[PDB]
Amino acid sequence: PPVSRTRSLLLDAASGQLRLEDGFHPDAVAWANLTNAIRETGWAYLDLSTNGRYNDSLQAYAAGVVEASVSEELIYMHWMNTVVNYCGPFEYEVGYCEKLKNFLEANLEWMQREMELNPDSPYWHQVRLTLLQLKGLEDSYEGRLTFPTGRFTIKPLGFLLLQISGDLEDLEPALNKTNGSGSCSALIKLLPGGHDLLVAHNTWNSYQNMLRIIKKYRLQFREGPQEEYPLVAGNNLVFSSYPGTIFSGDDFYILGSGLVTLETTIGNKNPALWKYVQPQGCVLEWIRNVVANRLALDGATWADVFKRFNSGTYNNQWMIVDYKAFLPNGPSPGSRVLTILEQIPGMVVVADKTAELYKTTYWASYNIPYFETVFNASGLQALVAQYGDWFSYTKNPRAKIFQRDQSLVEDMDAMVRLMRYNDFLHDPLSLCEACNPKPNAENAISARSDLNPANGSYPFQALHQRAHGGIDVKVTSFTLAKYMSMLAASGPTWDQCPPFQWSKSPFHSMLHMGQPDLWMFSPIRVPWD
Amino acid sequence: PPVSRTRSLLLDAASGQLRLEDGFHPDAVAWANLTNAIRETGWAYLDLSTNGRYNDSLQAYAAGVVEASVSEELIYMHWMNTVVNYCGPFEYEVGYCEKLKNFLEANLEWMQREMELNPDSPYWHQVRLTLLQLKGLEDSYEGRLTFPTGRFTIKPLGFLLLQISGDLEDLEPALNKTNGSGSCSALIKLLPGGHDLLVAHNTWNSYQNMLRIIKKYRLQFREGPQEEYPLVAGNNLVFSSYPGTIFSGDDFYILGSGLVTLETTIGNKNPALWKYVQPQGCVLEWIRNVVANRLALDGATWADVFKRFNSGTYNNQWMIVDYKAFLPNGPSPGSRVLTILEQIPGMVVVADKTAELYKTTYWASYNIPYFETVFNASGLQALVAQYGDWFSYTKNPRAKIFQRDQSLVEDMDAMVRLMRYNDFLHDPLSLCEACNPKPNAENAISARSDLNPANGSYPFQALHQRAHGGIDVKVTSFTLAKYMSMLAASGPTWDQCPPFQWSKSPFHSMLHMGQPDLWMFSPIRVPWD
Ligand SMILES: *[C@@H]1O[C@H](CO)[C@@H](O[C@@H]2O[C@H](CO)[C@@H](O[C@@H]3O[C@H](CO)[C@@H](O)[C@H](O)[C@@H]3O)[C@H](O)[C@H]2NC(C)=O)[C@H](O)[C@H]1NC(C)=O
Ligand SMILES: *[C@@H]1O[C@H](CO)[C@@H](O[C@@H]2O[C@H](CO)[C@@H](O[C@@H]3O[C@H](CO)[C@@H](O)[C@H](O)[C@@H]3O)[C@H](O)[C@H]2NC(C)=O)[C@H](O)[C@H]1NC(C)=O
Ligand SMILES: *[C@@H]1O[C@H](CO)[C@@H](O)[C@H](O)[C@H]1NC(C)=O
Ligand SMILES: *[C@@H]1O[C@H](CO)[C@@H](O)[C@H](O)[C@H]1NC(C)=O
Ligand SMILES: *[C@@H]1O[C@H](CO)[C@@H](O)[C@H](O)[C@H]1NC(C)=O
Ligand SMILES: *[C@@H]1O[C@H](CO)[C@@H](O)[C@H](O)[C@H]1NC(C)=O
Ligand SMILES: *[C@@H]1O[C@H](CO)[C@@H](O)[C@H](O)[C@H]1NC(C)=O
Ligand SMILES: *[C@@H]1O[C@H](CO)[C@@H](O)[C@H](O)[C@H]1NC(C)=O
Ligand code: NA
Ligand code: NA
C-alpha cells in the first residue's frame, strides 16, 4: 500500500450507482483511511466511518467497499499467505472440500431464508448488515459494485474463508478431514487498591498470518430494520485485525459502550459432539461475535446474543469486561464487571465472575476451559489421564506461570512484559518431561514454537517445531478504553528469545508477502502511529 | 525438490490399481527422474520413460503421474508464480472468465465426442494420449489415481492453463478481454562449406516464468489404437520446458526422428479474424504441437498434422529442420531440410525453404511473419504505416542485427553469443526515435525490458519497462541432435548487460519461489548437468 490512502463511497445521483473517490468527502455513504506502518511498527491502521443519513444496509455494504479499496494490496498479500490454496482445484481431500462447499452454501442459504421470513427482527437485521459488509468487501475488491435490495449470494470460498478461519478449526474434524495450536493467552488484572483494571490479550497464530491492521469502525447502525429504532450501543469499536477479515479474529475489541471483549480458543476433543455442528440453526462464530459486540450494553446482554444459534465452531472462553461497572479505587460491586462465557458444540455456559476477579485480583486465560462441566464434556479428562497436567486447568505450564508472576503487573508496561514473556530455556515451568530436550518453547505465555529442534521427541503435535506461536500483545486500561485506545506490540516475542527473522529461520521457504524480514517491534499506542 | 528424486508407477495386480513407488522399477508402467540444479545451472532435468508392454493409454496416463510425483514442489511454485490468480474467484473481468470457462468446456467436450465417434482414427488416438497425460499429471498432483477406460473430464482451470499459456494470448482478444511481448527469436545457420547446420532458439518471456526443466520423454506410443500399428516416429524427444507444462511452451524440440522443431510467436492484430477461433473444429496449439511432433517423419508430414483443426490461437512461425535431409559438407539437396509454417486465425501457409537456407546460408526468426500473405492478412501493414520499420519484416531492429551479425556464428559458442546478444546502450540499431531516451532494451536479439526507465516516453507497450525479455538460449548441431543433445543457458542475458537480480531490480515485490535471486548462469550441455 501507500503510506496513507483515503477513499470515499458516494451515492451518485447522476446514475443512482455507487462509485469510489479519492480523499475525504462529507456526504459520502462511507469513507476509509489506511495508514501502513508495517515496516516501522508492524501495524497498519484503518479508520472507517459511515454516514448516518443513509440506511444501515447501504452503510454496511459501503463499509465493506471503502475498506477493500484502501487495503487492496494487503488483502491480496494476506490472501496469498493464508488461504490461497485451501480447497483449490487440487485439494487432496476431495471428499472434505465437497462437504465444506455444501455445508457453507446450505448455511448461507439458511441465513437468507431467515432474513426473508423475519423482516422486522433486530437480530436478523444485524446478521444482514454483517453479511452485506462482507458482500461489499468482496464486490469492491472485484471492482464491480452492485448493492442488493433483497436477497443476495455470498461466495463460499471467497472472502468468507478469511472470516471463517477460526471456525474452520472445528469444521474440519466435524466433516471428517484427516489432518495442535494453543491459540492465545489473556490476562485481566485488577491493580492494588483497585486503582485501575487492566485487560490484555496475546494472540498465538501461524507466522504467515502476521500482516496486521488495527481497525477503528465508527458506524451508524440501528438496532432494527425500522428507523424508529435507537442506534446500536456498539457503533464505535477499535480492534486488532487482519487484511480482509472484517472482525478481530485473534479477538480483542474495545467497544464505545464501555465493553472490552476477548477470548482464548478452548476447542473440543470429543467427537460425539460434532453432531451439533449443522448448516441450519447454526451461525458461524465470527458473525455471532460481531452481532453481540454491536447490540450489547451489559456483559449479560452480550452473553445472551452470542449464545443464539451456537454453531460449535470456533470454541472459546469469552471474557466480557464492562468498564461502566468498574469504579476506580472502589470496592467490589458484586456483579457486572466480569462475565465468562464458554462454548463447545451444543453447550454454552455463562457466569458472572466479578467476585472471583476481586477475591483473587485477576483472571487468566489459556487453551483450557474454566467451567468444570465444559472441561468434562469436551473430553479433556482422558487427555489429563493420558498426558498429565499439560491438559489440567490449574496445573498446565501457562496456568502456573500466571500463578507465580501475575501479581507483578502493576501497570501497562508490566502487563506487556508478562504477556510477551518467554524464557523456556531457563524457566523450570517450561520443562517437558516426556520430551527430548526437556525445555519447550510452547510452555510460555507468548509461545515461540519455531525455537524447538526439528528433530526432537515430542508426545503431541502442539510441542513440535512450528512456524507458530505468540504474534502480538494488546493492552488497555480504564482511562484508555474511555478514550478508545490501546497499547499494541506486533510480532513474536523478543524480550528474551532471539528476535524472529524469516531469513535466518528454518521457514525461509514459506511465503510472507509484505511482512518484515526481522521482527523487533516495540509496543505503540493507538490511535495512530 | 531434492537434488535427485526417482518415482515409478506400477499396475499392482494385488488390487488392479495404480500406485507410486520410490526408485527405478523395471516392470513399471512408467518411471521418472528429476534432478534439480536450478541453483547451480538454472535448469532442472527430467528423464521420463514408459513401458511398451502396456497399452498407449495407460502409458500416457502414467507418464503424467510419474512426472508430477518427481516434480511436485516445482509445479506448486511455478503455478504460484504464473497462473495462480488467473480467473480466480475474484477476476475483475467476470464477463471474460465466464466466456473462457464456456469456451474451454465446450472445446474439451468436442474433443471427447470426436474420440467417441472415431475409435479407429490415429489422429484422435494421438490427441487422447496427450489429454490422458494431462489427466495423469493432474490426478497425480491431487494424489488420487483413477485411470479412465472411456470418456473423461479435464478441469478447465486446472493444469490446463499451464498448457494453454501461449494459446491464451489469442483467446483474450478473441473473447473481448480488455488488457506487447515480442515472444522469442530464432536462428538456423548453415556453416561455411556446409560443414554443419546449427539451429538455435531464445525464449522471450516474463521473468516470473523462470523455473525451467529440460525434459526427455522416452515413450512407447503407437500410431493408432490397434496394436498392429508401428511405433510413432517421435517416441524419443528432448525439449526445454517448465514445471507442469507437458510440452515445450517456449518451443524447442529435438526429436528422435531427426527433426528439430521451434517457433516464434507472430500473433495477430486483425480482429476481423477472431471469428475463426471456435470451440468446435479447433484444437488448441499445444496439443497440435505434440501430435505433430509424435507422428512426423518429414517436415512436410509435420506441417500436414499441425494444420489440422487450426485454432488461430498461439500464432507462430514454425521452423522444422530435418537432419535426415542434411548431408555434411555436401551441396543443396534442393528440398526437405527446412520447412516454414505460419499460422493466423483461419489461415495456414506452408513452404519448403531449403533453397533459401542454402542461398543465403541462414534463416532468422522474430515476431514478424515471413509470408507476404500472412503479413497482410494479420493486419501488420497498418502498423508499419503508423509506426514505421519496427513492424517491417526486413527493417525491424532484430532483422537488421541478424543481417549484419549472423555470418559470425561459426560454431556453438558463436551461436550462443549472438542469441544472447544485447548491447542496447551502444548499438545504433537499438535506437528508438519515437522514444525518450532513444536506446531501448527491447531492440536486441535477447531482450532486456527491465533495463528501460519506468518514466520513459514510449510509443507502445512492447517498449515500456517490463519484467520481460529473453530468458534462455538453446542450441544444437547435426552431431548433437544425432545424440539427442543440446546446449542450454538459463536466465536473462548478462554478456554485456548487468546480470539480472530480483533483489536489486524494480520488481523485487513480484513473487518468484524457487528462483535464484541472481542470474549469472553459463551454457551447459545436456544430457545431465
Ligand atoms: C436503502 O437505501 C437504498 C438507496 O437509497 C435503497 O436502494 C434502492 O432500492 C430501490 C428498490 O427498493 C431501487 O429503485 C428501484 O430499482 C428497480 C430496479 O432497477 C426499479 O424497478 C424501480 O423502478 C426502482 O427504481 C434503487 O435502485 C436502489 N438503489 C440502489 C443504489 O441500489 C434501499 O431500498 C434502501 N433499503 C434497503 C432495504 O436496503
Ligand atoms: C489398457 O490397459 C488397461 C489396463 O490393463 C485397461 O484398463 C482396464 O479396463 C477394464 C475395462 O475394459 C477394467 O476391467 C473392468 O472393470 C469394470 C469396472 O470395475 C468391471 O465392470 C469389469 O468386470 C472389468 O473388471 C479394468 O479395471 C481396467 N484397469 C484399470 C487399471 O483401470 C484398458 O481397458 C486398456 N485399454 C484402454 C482402452 O485404455
Ligand atoms: C486518516 O484519517 C484520519 C481521520 O481524521 C486522520 O487523522 C489521518 O491523518 C489520516 N491519515 C493520514 C496519515 O493521512
Ligand atoms: C464422520 O465419520 C463418522 C464415522 O467415524 C460418521 O459417523 C459421520 O457421519 C461422519 N461425519 C459427517 C456427517 O461427515
Ligand atoms: C469430570 O470427570 C471426572 C471423571 O473423569 C469426575 O471425577 C469429575 O467429578 C467430573 N466433573 C464434574 C463434576 O462434572
Ligand atoms: C536419473 O536417472 C538417469 C537415467 O539413467 C540417471 O542417469 C541419473 O543418474 C539419475 N539421476 C540421479 C542424479 O540420481
Ligand atoms: C467481441 O466484440 C465484438 C464487438 O466489438 C462482437 O462483434 C463480438 O461478438 C465479440 N466477440 C465474442 C464472440 O465474444
Ligand atoms: C500487402 O498490402 C499492401 C497494401 O497495404 C500491398 O501494397 C501489398 O502488395 C500487399 N501484399 C500482397 C502481395 O498481398
Ligand atoms: Na483465538
Ligand atoms: Na513463443
Short mmCIF file of N, CA, C and O in Angstrom, two decimals, chain A residues 76 79-80 84-85 89-94 138 141-144 155 157-159 509-511 513, chain B residues 76 79-80 84-85 89-94 138 141-144 155 157-159 509-511 513:
data_model
loop_
_atom_site.label_atom_id
_atom_site.label_comp_id
_atom_site.label_asym_id
_atom_site.label_seq_id
_atom_site.Cartn_x
_atom_site.Cartn_y
_atom_site.Cartn_z
N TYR A 76 -4.69 -8.80 -0.85
CA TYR A 76 -4.05 -9.71 -1.80
C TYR A 76 -2.93 -10.52 -1.15
O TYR A 76 -2.89 -11.74 -1.29
N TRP A 79 -4.26 -12.88 1.66
CA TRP A 79 -4.90 -13.99 0.96
C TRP A 79 -3.85 -14.97 0.44
O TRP A 79 -4.00 -16.19 0.59
N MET A 80 -2.78 -14.44 -0.16
CA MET A 80 -1.71 -15.24 -0.74
C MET A 80 -0.87 -15.98 0.30
O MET A 80 -0.25 -17.00 0.00
N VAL A 84 -4.81 -19.19 0.22
CA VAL A 84 -4.79 -19.16 -1.25
C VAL A 84 -5.10 -20.53 -1.88
O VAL A 84 -5.85 -20.60 -2.86
N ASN A 85 -4.55 -21.59 -1.31
CA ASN A 85 -4.73 -22.94 -1.85
C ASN A 85 -5.66 -23.84 -1.04
O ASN A 85 -5.75 -25.05 -1.30
N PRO A 89 -8.43 -26.05 -6.81
CA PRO A 89 -8.89 -27.02 -7.80
C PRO A 89 -8.11 -28.34 -7.72
O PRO A 89 -8.19 -29.16 -8.63
N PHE A 90 -7.38 -28.52 -6.62
CA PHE A 90 -6.44 -29.63 -6.48
C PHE A 90 -6.54 -30.40 -5.18
O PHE A 90 -5.98 -31.49 -5.07
N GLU A 91 -7.23 -29.83 -4.19
CA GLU A 91 -7.23 -30.39 -2.84
C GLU A 91 -7.19 -31.92 -2.86
O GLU A 91 -8.02 -32.57 -3.51
N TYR A 92 -6.22 -32.48 -2.13
CA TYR A 92 -6.10 -33.93 -1.99
C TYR A 92 -7.37 -34.53 -1.40
O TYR A 92 -7.86 -35.56 -1.88
N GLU A 93 -7.89 -33.89 -0.36
CA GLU A 93 -9.07 -34.36 0.34
C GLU A 93 -10.32 -33.86 -0.37
O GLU A 93 -11.01 -32.96 0.12
N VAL A 94 -10.59 -34.44 -1.54
CA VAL A 94 -11.72 -34.01 -2.39
C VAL A 94 -13.07 -34.33 -1.74
O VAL A 94 -14.09 -33.73 -2.10
N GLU A 138 -16.03 -7.93 -0.83
CA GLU A 138 -15.80 -8.79 -1.99
C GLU A 138 -16.04 -8.06 -3.32
O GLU A 138 -15.15 -8.02 -4.17
N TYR A 141 -13.37 -5.35 -4.06
CA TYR A 141 -12.11 -5.97 -4.47
C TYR A 141 -12.20 -6.50 -5.90
O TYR A 141 -11.22 -6.49 -6.63
N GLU A 142 -13.39 -6.97 -6.27
CA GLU A 142 -13.67 -7.46 -7.62
C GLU A 142 -13.90 -6.31 -8.60
O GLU A 142 -13.90 -6.51 -9.82
N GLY A 143 -14.10 -5.11 -8.07
CA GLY A 143 -14.22 -3.89 -8.87
C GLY A 143 -15.53 -3.69 -9.60
O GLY A 143 -15.60 -2.94 -10.57
N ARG A 144 -16.58 -4.37 -9.13
CA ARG A 144 -17.91 -4.25 -9.73
C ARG A 144 -18.98 -4.13 -8.65
O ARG A 144 -19.46 -5.14 -8.12
N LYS A 155 -20.25 -15.89 -1.94
CA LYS A 155 -19.45 -16.98 -2.49
C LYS A 155 -18.74 -17.75 -1.37
O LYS A 155 -18.00 -17.15 -0.58
N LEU A 157 -16.17 -19.85 -1.00
CA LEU A 157 -14.72 -19.86 -0.88
C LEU A 157 -14.07 -18.55 -1.35
O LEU A 157 -12.93 -18.54 -1.80
N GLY A 158 -14.83 -17.46 -1.23
CA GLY A 158 -14.31 -16.12 -1.50
C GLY A 158 -13.72 -15.54 -0.23
O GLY A 158 -12.96 -16.21 0.47
N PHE A 159 -14.08 -14.30 0.10
CA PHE A 159 -13.58 -13.68 1.32
C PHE A 159 -14.24 -14.21 2.59
O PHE A 159 -14.05 -13.67 3.68
N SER A 509 11.52 -20.59 3.42
CA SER A 509 10.84 -21.02 2.20
C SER A 509 9.37 -20.59 2.11
O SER A 509 8.88 -20.30 1.01
N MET A 510 8.68 -20.56 3.25
CA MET A 510 7.27 -20.16 3.31
C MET A 510 7.09 -18.71 2.86
O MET A 510 7.88 -17.84 3.23
N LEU A 511 6.06 -18.45 2.06
CA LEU A 511 5.83 -17.11 1.53
C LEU A 511 5.14 -16.20 2.55
O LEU A 511 4.25 -16.62 3.28
N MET A 513 4.47 -12.30 1.93
CA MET A 513 4.49 -11.02 1.20
C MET A 513 4.10 -9.85 2.10
O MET A 513 3.11 -9.92 2.83
N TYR B 76 4.08 -26.67 -7.94
CA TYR B 76 3.46 -25.75 -6.98
C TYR B 76 4.00 -24.33 -7.11
O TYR B 76 3.22 -23.37 -7.20
N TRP B 79 3.16 -22.77 -10.60
CA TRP B 79 1.75 -22.41 -10.53
C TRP B 79 1.56 -21.11 -9.74
O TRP B 79 0.81 -20.23 -10.17
N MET B 80 2.25 -21.00 -8.61
CA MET B 80 2.14 -19.84 -7.72
C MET B 80 2.75 -18.57 -8.32
O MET B 80 2.37 -17.46 -7.94
N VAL B 84 -1.68 -18.44 -10.82
CA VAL B 84 -2.39 -18.72 -9.56
C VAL B 84 -3.72 -17.96 -9.44
O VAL B 84 -4.72 -18.53 -9.00
N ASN B 85 -3.72 -16.69 -9.84
CA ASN B 85 -4.91 -15.85 -9.72
C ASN B 85 -5.63 -15.56 -11.04
O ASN B 85 -6.53 -14.72 -11.09
N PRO B 89 -11.57 -16.56 -7.96
CA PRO B 89 -12.94 -16.26 -7.53
C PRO B 89 -13.19 -14.75 -7.45
O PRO B 89 -14.20 -14.32 -6.88
N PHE B 90 -12.30 -13.97 -8.05
CA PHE B 90 -12.30 -12.51 -7.91
C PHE B 90 -12.18 -11.74 -9.20
O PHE B 90 -12.43 -10.53 -9.21
N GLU B 91 -11.77 -12.41 -10.27
CA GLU B 91 -11.43 -11.72 -11.51
C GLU B 91 -12.33 -10.51 -11.77
O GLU B 91 -13.56 -10.62 -11.75
N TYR B 92 -11.69 -9.36 -11.99
CA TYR B 92 -12.41 -8.13 -12.32
C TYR B 92 -13.27 -8.31 -13.57
O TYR B 92 -14.43 -7.90 -13.60
N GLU B 93 -12.69 -8.93 -14.59
CA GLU B 93 -13.36 -9.14 -15.86
C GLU B 93 -14.20 -10.41 -15.79
O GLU B 93 -13.85 -11.44 -16.39
N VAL B 94 -15.30 -10.34 -15.05
CA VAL B 94 -16.17 -11.50 -14.82
C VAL B 94 -16.88 -11.95 -16.10
O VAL B 94 -17.34 -13.09 -16.20
N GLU B 138 -2.47 -34.13 -13.48
CA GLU B 138 -3.42 -33.53 -12.54
C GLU B 138 -3.81 -34.49 -11.41
O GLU B 138 -3.65 -34.15 -10.23
N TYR B 141 -0.89 -35.14 -8.94
CA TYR B 141 -0.68 -33.98 -8.08
C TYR B 141 -1.77 -33.88 -7.01
O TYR B 141 -1.52 -33.44 -5.89
N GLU B 142 -2.98 -34.30 -7.38
CA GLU B 142 -4.12 -34.33 -6.47
C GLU B 142 -4.07 -35.55 -5.54
O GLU B 142 -4.81 -35.62 -4.55
N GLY B 143 -3.21 -36.51 -5.88
CA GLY B 143 -2.95 -37.68 -5.03
C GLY B 143 -4.03 -38.75 -5.04
O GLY B 143 -4.10 -39.56 -4.11
N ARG B 144 -4.85 -38.77 -6.08
CA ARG B 144 -5.91 -39.77 -6.22
C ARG B 144 -5.97 -40.30 -7.65
O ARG B 144 -6.61 -39.70 -8.52
N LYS B 155 -10.44 -30.65 -16.13
CA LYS B 155 -10.86 -29.43 -15.46
C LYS B 155 -10.31 -28.19 -16.20
O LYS B 155 -9.10 -28.07 -16.38
N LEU B 157 -9.79 -24.95 -15.61
CA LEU B 157 -8.82 -24.05 -14.99
C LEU B 157 -7.87 -24.77 -14.02
O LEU B 157 -7.37 -24.18 -13.06
N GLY B 158 -7.63 -26.05 -14.30
CA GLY B 158 -6.64 -26.84 -13.57
C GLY B 158 -5.28 -26.70 -14.24
O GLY B 158 -4.86 -25.59 -14.57
N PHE B 159 -4.60 -27.82 -14.46
CA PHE B 159 -3.30 -27.78 -15.13
C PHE B 159 -3.41 -27.53 -16.63
O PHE B 159 -2.41 -27.64 -17.36
N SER B 509 9.29 -6.99 -5.59
CA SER B 509 7.99 -7.28 -4.99
C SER B 509 7.29 -8.51 -5.56
O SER B 509 6.61 -9.23 -4.83
N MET B 510 7.45 -8.74 -6.87
CA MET B 510 6.84 -9.89 -7.56
C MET B 510 7.37 -11.20 -6.99
O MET B 510 8.57 -11.34 -6.75
N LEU B 511 6.48 -12.17 -6.79
CA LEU B 511 6.87 -13.45 -6.21
C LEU B 511 7.50 -14.39 -7.24
O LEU B 511 7.05 -14.46 -8.39
N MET B 513 9.11 -17.94 -6.34
CA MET B 513 9.51 -19.06 -5.48
C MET B 513 10.42 -20.04 -6.22
O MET B 513 10.12 -20.45 -7.34
#
